[PDB]
Amino acid sequence: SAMKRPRSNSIVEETAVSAYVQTCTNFKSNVTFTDISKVSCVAYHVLLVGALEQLRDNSLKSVLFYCPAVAEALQRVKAGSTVKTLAEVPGRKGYTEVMVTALPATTSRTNCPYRADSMSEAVAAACGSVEEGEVLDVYVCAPAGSETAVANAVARAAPHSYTAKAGQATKAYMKQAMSLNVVMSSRAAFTQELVRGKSVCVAELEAICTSVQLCQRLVDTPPCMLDTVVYAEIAAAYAAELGVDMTVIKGDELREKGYGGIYAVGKCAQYPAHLVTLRYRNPNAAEGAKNIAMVGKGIVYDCGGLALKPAAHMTNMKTDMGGSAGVFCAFIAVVRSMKMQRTHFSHIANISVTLCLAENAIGPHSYRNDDVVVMKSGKSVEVMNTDAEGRIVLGDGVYYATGEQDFVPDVLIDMATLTGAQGVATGSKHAGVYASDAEAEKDMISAGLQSGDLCYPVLYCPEYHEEVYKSPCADMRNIANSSSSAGSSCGGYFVEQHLSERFRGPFVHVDMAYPTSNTAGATGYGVTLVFEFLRQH
Amino acid sequence: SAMKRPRSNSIVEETAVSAYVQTCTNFKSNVTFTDISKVSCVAYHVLLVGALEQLRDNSLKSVLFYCPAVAEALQRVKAGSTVKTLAEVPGRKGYTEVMVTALPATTSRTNCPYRADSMSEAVAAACGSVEEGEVLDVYVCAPAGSETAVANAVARAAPHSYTAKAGQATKAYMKQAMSLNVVMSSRAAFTQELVRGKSVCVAELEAICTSVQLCQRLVDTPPCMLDTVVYAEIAAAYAAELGVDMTVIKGDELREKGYGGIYAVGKCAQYPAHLVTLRYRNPNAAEGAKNIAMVGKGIVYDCGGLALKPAAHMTNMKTDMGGSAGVFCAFIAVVRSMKMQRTHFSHIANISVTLCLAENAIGPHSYRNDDVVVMKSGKSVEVMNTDAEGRIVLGDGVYYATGEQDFVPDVLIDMATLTGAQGVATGSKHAGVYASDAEAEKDMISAGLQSGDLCYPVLYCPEYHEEVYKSPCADMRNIANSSSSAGSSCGGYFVEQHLSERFRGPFVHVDMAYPTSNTAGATGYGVTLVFEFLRQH
Amino acid sequence: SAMKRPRSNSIVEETAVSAYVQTCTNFKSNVTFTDISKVSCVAYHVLLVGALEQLRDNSLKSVLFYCPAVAEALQRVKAGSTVKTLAEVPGRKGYTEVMVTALPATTSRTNCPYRADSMSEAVAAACGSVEEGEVLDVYVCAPAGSETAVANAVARAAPHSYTAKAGQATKAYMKQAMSLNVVMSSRAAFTQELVRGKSVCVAELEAICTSVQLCQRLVDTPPCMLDTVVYAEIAAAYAAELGVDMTVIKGDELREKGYGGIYAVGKCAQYPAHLVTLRYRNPNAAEGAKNIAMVGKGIVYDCGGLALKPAAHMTNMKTDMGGSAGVFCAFIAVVRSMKMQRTHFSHIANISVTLCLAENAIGPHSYRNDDVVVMKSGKSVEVMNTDAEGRIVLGDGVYYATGEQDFVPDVLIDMATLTGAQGVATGSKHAGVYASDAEAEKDMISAGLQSGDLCYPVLYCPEYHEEVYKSPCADMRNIANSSSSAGSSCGGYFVEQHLSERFRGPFVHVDMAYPTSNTAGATGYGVTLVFEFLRQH
Ligand SMILES: CCCCC[C@H](CC(=O)NO)C(=O)N[C@H](C(=O)N1CCC[C@H]1CO)C(C)C
Ligand SMILES: CCCCC[C@H](CC(=O)NO)C(=O)N[C@H](C(=O)N1CCC[C@H]1CO)C(C)C
Ligand SMILES: CCCCC[C@H](CC(=O)NO)C(=O)N[C@H](C(=O)N1CCC[C@H]1CO)C(C)C
Ligand SMILES: [Mn+2]
Ligand SMILES: [Mn+2]
Ligand SMILES: [Mn+2]
Ligand SMILES: [Mn+2]
Ligand SMILES: [Mn+2]
Ligand SMILES: [Mn+2]
């Protein structure tokens, strides 16, 4: 295993990567759900979170940790605030920590109506006092239809599994010391009751939780450990677990087979570039079932190339493989759901995920500001800034997915931590969606509201983008000739040009540079956006 | 006149400003329209511009400059290109210059379907060879419904009236040497035929042309000439011409009457701050007629304050009164249309325009990064960056318009060259619209497509904006505590907070920092957006 | 009052400054102390804070809010952490909020052994839930000798009195909604028992609390309100209250009487420069009693002059009058203590405080990088950077205090928010002390450890500083000719050169640029350092 791997020159380093792989390939979330109608014990710690109306309801006096101190906490909580206390509750002996959090009063049209953001903030703050081996009970007052946003909001708010604090290096950088037990007021996960005529079950919410958290792990892991060879070995194990076809083009194979864009970007790095694609044909696909290809930026580290980033922009480029992991782990959850019941993604015939893997490293073998590169699609590109490497590798990615597979997709989802312009456009919680079909734009926005992985449209206007990418000696450049030329859209437009001409349906580009991480680290963004988006028709 | 004015200490300077005022108060466009069915002569220069289909039609052999060289030019023009020639045409003796331009093949959903951008590029390039006193005939092949976009596209593409080249200073910086004669293939302006059941007539298109070009003049004029006292004198003359009510709050009157935000911003400048508001009650208002208030950033020069801008960001801050002029000149055109026929803006009862006038100047009396200012609305503001001055003055503007007039608006339109984040968001041709009502957002986008003054939504999410404006000692700051916090929306949100609580309908903020100008200078952006937006219901 | 003042041209602005003055001239802290042996009621909110040993002692079961939930909180608190709960306690009806905070386990030689920093962090976090008109009880487990550090640590951690949130502008920017009641385990304040043979009484701790908080108010107030004329009017009222001599040199009087350094710095500003000095002869001075002059940088706003600071370095220059306020409010407390008992500062004959008041403003009348200025001391200075304005004004300050008063000081204390080099040197909690006498250095360090206003020596080496201030055409420059030339010491050395030759005892320069403020704003730093320093012999 450690000897199979073509990675480092070192037994010790290789032995520890073999363990890191395991923690990734057998990963399980540390979230459980319990049917509110079957609560018989109460955890060492309890969080209660909901709309102020719902918290003050008499329906809550049933919950098994109700008692006078808790009742008092409910008199004192105001919209947006928190009240915390110890209490002697039945359902436990001794004292129990109860934290009570009201969600905010007002929500706007562009935000998730269940307020999954506040749920995450409230969860995170309750986990801080949970001791090794204990459980945090999370009591959520959210209406039926909110299950996936809750599963996401909680999963992503748990203490992160990647750490090296206090010796964890010796245990594969993996810590899952505590545990979250979700108790929703709605029972739809347990009854399979239909909401907007769709059902989502408990085994699915676990698959989401596992996938969101695997996503936080891969993102959070530094590139000294999660490089392109390791990331690829992981993808292989998930391939053999799920029983799916896998296509890998690696290193010189990229250049030999004409993927000049991604080979150029990753040619300098210690460990080489890969296009890795996993795909499943659904055996229970219905007559109407569409085909879906997904593509993600797997830049394991972005140093900037020769357009080397400064120190303060370069940290966190750990996370520049976020788009990649979002769609990779969404693939896993979707396929897992497909294997659970005949009907679950019945309207999907083929699903494909393409990982565009590479480190953008700086050195003699670096692609230069001025190099001219011939992408797989045939289009020639004049590299003006080597730090716009995402565009390029993704260009070869989307061409592979649209023009080299044995089925033609009917929709292409591009996901990438692409640009800082994104943050200026749409802030740090909403991804930027650059979409060639108004209906697919609306639908992605909506899957964002339902999922709690928010989204917002950015300018789609190829005629205007075309005219800031003009090169004197190639088909296009890879950065615009002007400042303040709608920077996130320009990133999408670049990638759009490399779609095989045989592909005729929507191209949906999700730029999630800022939403992919926050103070605590990786958010898992993307995993639940895609699950929703694909689940809804 | 020159002695009435409380401006400079100088007879000469004051004599020349009196002339500059005149050129502004009697301004007329230099655009005419001629009914295509009544063309009897052909101009020294001719431009033909349209969709390639429409150009190659046999319908064109009728135009009075048809001849073999022209026919040949039509064989050679390809989509997007230009062909130019001299020809002996009947309708003139001697040779005539004919330029033939095909509009582009493909347009996207976010752009004007008539391609008013290409029309403007094509016009501009034909005007360059027109000699003093001559006429350029502009033959446009555009379908009925495109009249306002054409009037705009052409008006704004003429050589600019503000110049000091070759002695023009002695003629009030005003040059209108040539003239454009528009000949559209559609006759709807001349027949009053209904399109989508609305009619627009020739006297209206002239009012638009005049207003777009007055807008380019005011914007283009430097602040050594167009300062707040002069800009105010102009607004007064237009008030007395159109017979409307005018309210001016000036200098110490602002501070005495509680407009701390705008008084703070402009207190350092040579010439003082003004809130200037013009308003008309429509005598022919129908039963349903709504009320409309408009507000614009009139920062005549933005030096940055003490957060002084560098040299290269500071040039063109001439144009930082663009939002102001767009809505001011839209007011003029709208009111002019109202005075033309009983029915023309029948669904509008009251219209108001508020100019937020001030120079952001640097000096001892400057408002500081740390000053705390009490806006008219009562909300206290902690100034962290004095270069976000637009927010502030506009804050007092919208409060005046929503809370101090003798009618309550049902819609507030805020227009401002507000932020560079705008350019990063939505490029240099599309304004950023920050809108509190999804229907009003869609409607503004649409008035942009019909008008050729383009637009694109930006994130509306006050819950997320609220949390980056937190101050420890005031209600809010005036810049966000984070980079990449959706910068254009944050600008709108700041202004939104100062709306009087009595105002209950949509707030539509248009951030047009980049679309307000291009290489040649001021575009007139805003004038035709607002005309369309208000004309459609 | 509002008409006496030579300030603004405005009745409204002047009426509100008259009220701001009042809030400053009648200021009282909102801290009280209660003898632990006489606690009969318990407040709505309670904080318990101490060393873990002391918290777990059985001595605590007596406190009137002891009960089982509280007992449980004490089992759970670990060194450095916090535990919070509601409880039914006797001493109150209903529920009471109890927060329990353990101070940190380990302290180093350069920090206050009572850990006044953690006390402040713990207080601040308990005040956040206290409602209008309520009381927070603060139970501190600290040994006798810690009274002044506690009075300081708590006073400075209260919610700040300067605010404009929610209409406070209409109530003079003054909010004191809640109240803190300190209950120390030691009774030395109440018994007058001697510690290291010195006693400190309750009326003194109140005078400290009042002075620390007046200091936070003056600092926190922006310069649009707290300018040099207002700051001077305040100093006058405190002069007439305390019955002390006052000398003011203002505006042209500075230049006429030879104070070129400070007149130069402040000549550009809206409101003019002042040297303001307050001084008391102690009627109960003992035979040995020394004389003490104090001097502080009162730069009410530092824009940088023509060496204009960028936006992000310029905010918080509100606080550039911190050194000034520290020593001003220390003067008040000391004098107040003197008036309380015959013996209290018996070893002090004369005390003097000199405020070096000015705004460093940018404009035509600005002192330039290249101007040569003749300080009061006769020494000529070549201004190379106008943003090193503190040095200069303080130079005239120390000369006044050492050479123009009717007594000669035996020690000069210079206090100033002088340099950013300070932060690089000694961090954000320790001031930099540049001291001409090793014994006075040690003593100031020690008054810092006892007071909780920390301190740390910086390089004293005039022979090395002399050689980086060489000018070709003046006695010295005002900034060093080299980067990384011990920047905080160089600031002190500049000021040292302007001491009158008649002054022969120690010069102690305290550079407190970073310790003067934190996230929440002004810390009051300086007030309690000086009280301690002077109290100890
Ligand atoms: C033109 C540079 C390439 C655009 C894409 C990069 C983001 C990136 O590195 N993707 O791989 C970017 O936006 N970088 C930001 C950026 O805009 N930069 C980089 C240096 C200055 C400024 C120039 O646009 C930083 C500051 C977050
Ligand atoms: C935070 C500054 C205030 C935001 C608004 C200004 C635009 C403005 O001056 N309006 O009056 C801006 O975006 N300025 C741009 C900008 O973003 N700046 C200014 C200096 C660096 C950078 C900081 O955001 C420039 C470069 C076009
Ligand atoms: C040489 C400048 C004058 C030294 C004193 C100033 C602090 C000050 O302004 N006092 O009134 C300083 O240290 N400023 C800092 C500083 O060191 N600067 C200012 C700009 C760059 C750098 C140069 O030393 C800033 C960044 C906190
Ligand atoms: Mn990247
Ligand atoms: Mn990059
Ligand atoms: Mn501006
Ligand atoms: Mn500005
Ligand atoms: Mn200073
Ligand atoms: Mn300075």
Q: What's the oligomerization state?
A: part of a larger assembly
Read across the widest sheet of chain A, the strand sequence of neighbours is: 7-8-10-9-13-17-14-15
Determine the CATH superfamily of the largest domain in chain A.
Zn peptidases
Distance between the termini of chain A: 42 Å
Please compute the radius of gyration of chain A using only Cα atoms.
23 Å
Main sheet summary of chain A: 8 strands, mixed
Shape of chain A: globular
Protein name (chains A, B, C): Putative aminopeptidase
Family (chains A, B, C): Belongs to the peptidase M17 family.
Keywords (chains A, B, C): Aminopeptidase, Hydrolase, Metal-binding, Protease
GO molecular function (chains A, B, C): manganese ion binding; metalloaminopeptidase activity; peptidase activity
Describe the model:
This is part of a larger assembly, with 3 copies of chain A (537 residues). Chain A has 537 residues and is of the alpha/beta class. Chain A folds into 2 domains: 192 residues, Zn-dependent exopeptidases (Rossmann fold); 345 residues, Aminopeptidase (3-Layer(aba) Sandwich). Chain A is 34% helix and 19% strand. The first copy, chain A, is built from 18 helices and 19 strands. In chain A, helix 15 packs across helix 18. In chain A, 55% of the residues are buried. Chains in contact: A-B, A-C, B-C. Chains A and B meet through helix 14 and helix 16 of A and helix 14 and helix 16 of B. Bound molecules: actinonin (3 copies) and manganese (II) ion (MN) (6 copies). One manganese (II) ion binds next to strand 9 of chain A. One manganese (II) ion (MN) binds next to loops of chain B. It is classed as hydrolase.
